[PDB]
A paper describes a structure:
R1C1 replaces all residues of this region with the hSSAT1 protein sequence, R1C2 replaces the first half of the residues, R1C3 replaces the first three quarters of the residues, and R1C4 replaces the latter half of the residues of this region. Despite crystallizing in a range of crystallography space groups, six structures adopted the apo-conformation of VcSpeG. Minor differences in residue positions were observed in the overlaid R1C2 (K23-E29) and R3C1 (R149, L150, F151, K152) crystal structures and models. On the other hand, only substituting the first eight residues of this loop (R1C2) caused a minimal (1.7-fold) decrease in activity compared to WT. Based on the kinetic results, it became clear that the region of the allosteric loop that was critical for activity was between residues 31–34 (WFEE). In the WT structure, this portion of the allosteric loop forms several important interactions, including an NH-arene interaction between Q86 and W31, π-π interactions between F32 of Region 1 and F149 of Region 3, an H-bond between the terminal amine of spm and the sidechain of E33 in the allosteric site, and a hydrophobic interaction between E34 and the methylenes of spm in the allosteric site. The R1C1, R1C3, and R1C4 constructs all have MEEQ in place of WFEE, which would disrupt these interactions and may explain the reduced activity of these constructs. On the other hand, the R1C2 construct retained these residues and may explain why this construct retained activity. The investigation of alterations to Region 1 of the VcSpeG protein (R1C1-R1C4) showed we could replace residues in the first half of the allosteric loop (R1C2) and retain moderate activity, but exchanging residues in either the second half of the loop (R1C4), the first three quarters of the loop (R1C3) or the entire loop (R1C1) caused the enzyme to be inactive. Since the R1C2 construct still maintained significant activity, it appears retention of acidity in the allosteric site may enable polyamine binding and subsequent catalysis, especially when significant van der Waals and complementary electrostatic interactions between Regions 1 and 3 were maintained.
Spermidine/spermine N-acetyltransferases (SSATs) are catabolic enzymes that acetylate polyamines and are critical for maintaining intracellular polyamine homeostasis. SpeG is an SSAT protein found in a variety of bacteria, including the human pathogen Vibrio cholerae. This protein adopts a dodecameric structure and contains an allosteric site, making it unique compared to other SSATs. The allosteric site is located between monomers that form the hexamers of the dodecamer, and some evidence has been provided that shows when polyamine binds to these sites, the dodecamer tightens.
Numbering used by the authors:
A (entry chain I), B (entry chain F), I (entry chain J), J (entry chain L), K (entry chain H), L (entry chain G): 5 to 170
C (entry chain A), D (entry chain B), G (entry chain E), H (entry chain K): 3 to 170
E (entry chain D): 3 to 21, 26 to 170
F (entry chain C): 4 to 170
Write the structure that this text describes.
Amino acid sequence: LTLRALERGDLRFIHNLNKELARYEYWFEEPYESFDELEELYNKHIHDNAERRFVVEDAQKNLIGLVELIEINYIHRSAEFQIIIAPEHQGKGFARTLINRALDYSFTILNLHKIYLHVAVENPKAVHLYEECGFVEEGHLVEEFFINGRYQDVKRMYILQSKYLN
Amino acid sequence: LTLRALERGDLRFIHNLNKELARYEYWFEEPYESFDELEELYNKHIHDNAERRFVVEDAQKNLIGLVELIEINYIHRSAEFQIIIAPEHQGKGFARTLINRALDYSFTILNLHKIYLHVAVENPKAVHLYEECGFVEEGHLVEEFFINGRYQDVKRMYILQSKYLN
Amino acid sequence: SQLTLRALERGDLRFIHNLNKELARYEYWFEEPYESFDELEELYNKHIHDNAERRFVVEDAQKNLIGLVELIEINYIHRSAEFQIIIAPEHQGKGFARTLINRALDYSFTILNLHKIYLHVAVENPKAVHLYEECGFVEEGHLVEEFFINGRYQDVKRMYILQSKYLN
Amino acid sequence: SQLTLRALERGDLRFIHNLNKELARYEYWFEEPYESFDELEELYNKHIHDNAERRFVVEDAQKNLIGLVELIEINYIHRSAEFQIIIAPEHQGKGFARTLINRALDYSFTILNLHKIYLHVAVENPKAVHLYEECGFVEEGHLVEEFFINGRYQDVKRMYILQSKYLN
Amino acid sequence: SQLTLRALERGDLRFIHNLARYEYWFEEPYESFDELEELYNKHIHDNAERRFVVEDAQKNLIGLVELIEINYIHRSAEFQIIIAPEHQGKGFARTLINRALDYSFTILNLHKIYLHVAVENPKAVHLYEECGFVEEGHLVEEFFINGRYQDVKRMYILQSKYLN
Amino acid sequence: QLTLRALERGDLRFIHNLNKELARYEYWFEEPYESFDELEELYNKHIHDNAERRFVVEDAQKNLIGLVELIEINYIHRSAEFQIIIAPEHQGKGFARTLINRALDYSFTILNLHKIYLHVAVENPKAVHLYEECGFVEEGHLVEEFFINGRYQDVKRMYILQSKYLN
Amino acid sequence: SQLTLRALERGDLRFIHNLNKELARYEYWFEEPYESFDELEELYNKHIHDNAERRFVVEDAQKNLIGLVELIEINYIHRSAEFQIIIAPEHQGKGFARTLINRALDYSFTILNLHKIYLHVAVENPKAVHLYEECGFVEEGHLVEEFFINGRYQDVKRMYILQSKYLN
Amino acid sequence: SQLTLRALERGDLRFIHNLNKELARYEYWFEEPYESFDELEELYNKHIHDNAERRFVVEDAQKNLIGLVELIEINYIHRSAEFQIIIAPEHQGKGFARTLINRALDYSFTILNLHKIYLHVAVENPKAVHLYEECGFVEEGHLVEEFFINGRYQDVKRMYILQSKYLN
Amino acid sequence: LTLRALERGDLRFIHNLNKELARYEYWFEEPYESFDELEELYNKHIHDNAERRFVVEDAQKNLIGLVELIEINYIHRSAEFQIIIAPEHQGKGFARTLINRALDYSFTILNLHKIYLHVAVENPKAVHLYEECGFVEEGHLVEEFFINGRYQDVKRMYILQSKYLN
Amino acid sequence: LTLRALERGDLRFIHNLNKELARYEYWFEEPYESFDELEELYNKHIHDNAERRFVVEDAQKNLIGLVELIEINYIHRSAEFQIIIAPEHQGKGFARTLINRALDYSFTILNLHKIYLHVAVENPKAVHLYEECGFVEEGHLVEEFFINGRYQDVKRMYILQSKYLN
Amino acid sequence: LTLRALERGDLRFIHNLNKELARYEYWFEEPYESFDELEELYNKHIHDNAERRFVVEDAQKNLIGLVELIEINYIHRSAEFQIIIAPEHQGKGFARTLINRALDYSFTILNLHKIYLHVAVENPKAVHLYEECGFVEEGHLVEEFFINGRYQDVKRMYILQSKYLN
Amino acid sequence: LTLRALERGDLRFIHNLNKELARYEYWFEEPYESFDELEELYNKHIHDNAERRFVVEDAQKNLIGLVELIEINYIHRSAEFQIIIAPEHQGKGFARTLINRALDYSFTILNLHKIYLHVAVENPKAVHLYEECGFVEEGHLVEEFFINGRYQDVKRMYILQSKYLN
């Protein structure tokens, strides 16, 4: 597997990765639900560095998933991490590799200090494998997001540049 | 049935759908009658969340209808629902499922509190259908809209998030 | 029927321009003179959203453009509007005028909810006057030397119809 | 006599705005609705050089503004224009209307070189109709339910005069 | 009762700002006077909403009348009435409502005027009924006001009933 | 058998080429211009202005034959200066008479103008005879009015009224 | 003698306005129509640095404003210009016209280096014609029905003078 | 109380800029860094109608500003927002924080109809944590080395309050 | 050989020609160096008639030279004439024809009275060329221009309209 | 006698002087004739160094005259000098001292290489004065300026920094 | 002494301070030579974060100098420091405190890692001042800058966040 | 090997060259990662000469590497040189020839005075290469950049035209 900076031609894969009416999606903190308004948001934030996205693809160049570093602050050197694996390539053991490739980019190139993420409390397997990757719970945000018709709690888990490098 | 977000390519469809039923059409509360005027109004409000529209295409991949949420207020958490099915694909039992899908999106994704709609009193079949989906009459607006050369009364019917979820 | 009325599009503008080349007339677009196609297209884009005037092109069964229907000087307080209809000489005399007039009135009285529709017809064209009379219009004025047409000040009949008469 | 006609100024806009506070009608400025003084001021500055309409403030020898004289819908191809006169409530009833109407016709036919001046007078006021008839106007139409004034569609008389009749 | 209506002008914006609630201007949220003033200059020519201030003989503003959601095809409009707390209870509400109805039905040529009134304010309901309004709807939990969803009576009056 | 069409931006270059063959200093709505880029900006600036009206003439094959210009238009006095410029390609085939009459017809039957005047070089008597056959009459012999081709040249101002043309 | 020509200033616009209204006629500023002072001031600001037209106020030794001298339609390729003189009635008939005309010709032939100065004068005003003749102007045209003055088309003489004749 | 909470205005910009200078920070305006006042004013003019953040200044009886209350990261789908409060050192410690915090929660839960209001407070400031806890907030996270303040990475307590708890 | 008024499409020619031939580049007396600066200055002074520029193109439309009338005074009817032939088409005798075409346009179209120019005193070939074209020496400006790191004298030579026409 | 930099308050003095000379005035090579035109041109070239003007006042600070440096070219370090003395203080021998002061300022502060000027050939008095001041004739421009109805030749005379310093 | 972010009103100060202390100053690495050009550049680069400037002023509200942090890189966390004190306030012992204030802002607020500076070797007083404030030499650049008409060797000195904070 | 200026068609080659080295790239001091924003920056700085790039191609016009002259300061006659070669054409000895060609273009055509470069301290083979080419160490920048997860030092090596030309 290999990561690559997101291109305009990849936007359609993003729109198909998470189908509408199931997740209220944002692009640089701007709501979007169609491809045409997504394309305009991409053109508007093509140079904005507050959020960086990369598409992962295998040797056959079959797009497998997306990694998003959002809410990037270059003074506190923190960023929220998100990983979205394609349904067809899910369960093949790529989660750990993609997460480690994201942490590698964040701590060895961007020179960030902290990488936090929000994970649904109702997904313990993800929480456990994130802990195995090197994350630690720093918060149990109560009713943070209204998802699928319910206010859900989320575990905020972080990892520091020191741990990953050493 | 497939409920997708509206794209610029679908503008020519809804326009042809609007000319089959004589209506003084509004796009974000702006009158329009030509396709060029519609296209420019679409480009002007492409990022306006005051109204959300979704096209309806069947299994054959043919576009058959439109679902509109308008007058969306995110303080009071209310929205007006409207559904349109082409005459060819009416009477096939799609309206019920599409209404349920719209209510699902409004109450499980947008986290809206109320969904109201106007239905012509002279169309009693639609009134009963909406009643079967959970809507309840809250008003009998007298001579609200001038339709087909006569001021007609319309029943205002609402449904709440509590009843839908519970 | 055989005729369909469709809202005016930018692609149809040049057809409008050609009609005015066949019928020598000092043309206006939203009360602003125009004679070049560029001036027309810039005035079209300027008033794309202005509802003071509404224009519908007429296309036959074979999607051939045959005429224009203009509702100008629309007023939403007095609920009045001046109607005008043009037909290409090729498709003139084929019994379309009456159907298009009825369609225009139908749009004005069942959709826009207007109250009155008036028009001007030259006194020297009594056939048109009779046709409008057959469609329901009635003379309310004989404007003397109102316009300067083809080298002479000509009188015009101001004829009108009301929503009540058309719907009832 | 002693009345003076003067081209409208930006400072006079508050007099114009005050005239229509005691007149219950939907006011227009260059065919554009206005209600507040702000709308009137921005429309004045928008059409400061537009010649489609002309306006003259009428004032006394004491420089007391008494009324207004408008020439709207001016067309320089057909050479027509709609005349309109308003006299302040505190100055109406002194017999100024006739002299001001003649001064309007004089300007229209001796300076602007117009061919026709028409006007609309309500059918429910034959005294004004007669005054216009004395000044040279003659009826050319009885427009039925043209406007909606004070809760009812009222008919109006369209009356005209030509440059030749006034100058000869 | 010699109260006169006047078109809203920029000089009156400050009064409307000082007159908590989630207010709108041509369906655009505003909290600050600068935000309101830019919205006013933006919709200076928009006729989707018409506003008029009512003042007494000595030019003392006492209330505001708003016509919003004006539709010139169906000829309807939502009416909102605000009276300054200093002039409340002096018997002007009836005059303001009837002067608004007179303008709507004698000048604008509208066909229907509807308004929303809190179900927990039956005195306003009775007053509107005296002015000629009739209940056409009992909207349930239409607005979140002061921490609770409140029902509101939608009541209308037609041009015919008022003119005749 | 020719046609007259209102001038459009696509035809601007043709006007520029015409002025390359006729060595003159050209104006557009009374503003000097010598570059096509300056002409195109002036065209877009005065697109809705009606102080001047221009029409290009075409044949059956839609080939450009020339230009007619009504400038210095006055809507109070109902006057306008006429100027016809036919390209050298189609000069001498007898099109001048037709286009002059068509310009007068448009001026007196559509625009409702009172007077149409024009300036013609005294050193070009053939044009004077042409305009005289088309109904024009000399009302002036302006002495050294324009500096043309290295010399101050006299020009005849010749006019025609709406009455004579329509009666 | 005692007469001084000064360059026009914004403060002098009122004088021009009042002066033009005393001789009622359609007023132009840089070939753009105007009637109101507010419109004149905005046109002055627009063409403050435009050299197509140059105007000069006339003042007495007591700085009493007498009249105006206008050089319009100035062409710096053909080196022509149209002259116009407007003296206030309260100072007319005192011989100022001759001196002001000579001063205008001097400025135009000794400072601007113009070639021709032409003018239009009403045929029906013979006194002015002979005045311009005495100043050196010669008739070059009899423009028939050129202008519309006080309800009647009038013929005007076009008279010219050249730089070589004035300087020699 | 005689403490008024007022929506932010242009004139208030130069106060918050000075208040931010007093408490050395890397300030943001709608998630955009700014340092100078001119940059802040351009950002205000840009985000004047942006409802993603809402700011309210505090002024005392003398009508002088003392504090600021910010609602940022306002999500109208999840109905969440980050709360921040700043009080000038000179007026700090006078028991105003609790009143202002309750007024901010009142506006967030009774007008904006929000669900959760959360905030970040430095662990090294236990007095602030206590005050927020007494105002109804409850700890939900202990962010480790989240922010870099005064040359060190400091932990912060993320504490929240729900609409249901506040209203009941 | 045709003389055409300068258009925007020729800006990149004179620019290169001004760098190849080291020239103190001004546009209407406002100095620049960048190409975008040239294009902005052109757009700013497109209607300015204080300076007139004309490119010279052959039959195949290859730009060979530039004719610049600058410091134009419409009261005194004078203007400074500058000719610049590109090195590619230099030594082919075009200089004489272009000088006369420029004199013709100045004296038969613009109705100018005097055309003067400055020529380096250390270039007697150009001096004799202009003398043949009708110009006559009227001044010997001492140390007038700083050329190749050296203050040099320049001859000012003039020609009058009466001489060219008569 | 003292020379002071020109300021707004002095404009009305400049204008007045120009009204006494039948000259076609300029301000940064822009024709003007009215005070309003002069004021707008002054505010347009307030920060332009192409021209520098200094007013001349006596001990009592009465306005005596004006010195103008125009066509200042900082690449060649030249500038044209013009001197105007009010008619009230003419014939008192101030022109000679003011020319010396102007030359001193130009060669000392501005560090200019040449200061040239034009003087009418039919005004030998000014020619003799400038010759006494150090200027030397370098050109006899034929019919350079149209003055008082006739084209007059003008002497262009210069003075170099070296002569004035050494 | 206090530090304040540079604003438009201060532009005429730095301009008069960059001409007094001769320097071909760049505004965000952009050539400028006029006040109006500097003002346009300020409003053009008002939001750019690559460079941060702070004007230092006295308790009497009298400006004394400027402090610039240019070449800011948020990945490597480097920034070049520069400080220019007005001649009138030099020798007062301010430079030391201003250097410490800039280092404080750079290491305690911006969370920068390295701060380097270029200082002329022929100015040993400044070099020793920097050495006293904690800077250390890392490079002896030969003929890097052109000062007083000569190529002068400069010294590149640096300091890190750890030393300053620890 | 021949050196040719950069064209838009070559941008993709540059993008592929950056795939070998996983470091954050800049175009005219603007951060970029994806190809779309690279093309946008290329079109943004198409006319800016502050940085000059030239591509290398062999006899068969097969792309080999890139030569960049960045941080060009025309006032101090300095420039930072950088050379990259595709992995498929390394070890061919092209390094020395391309470095000599670059230095020749810099010291003969651009007439630059100094050429400096930054080379990783942990890559001594490149240091020796540049030493043989003519460069000499003038600085040992401590922790200048953040590479591969660690602050690394870099040698600043220079060469003057006084040494190359002589």
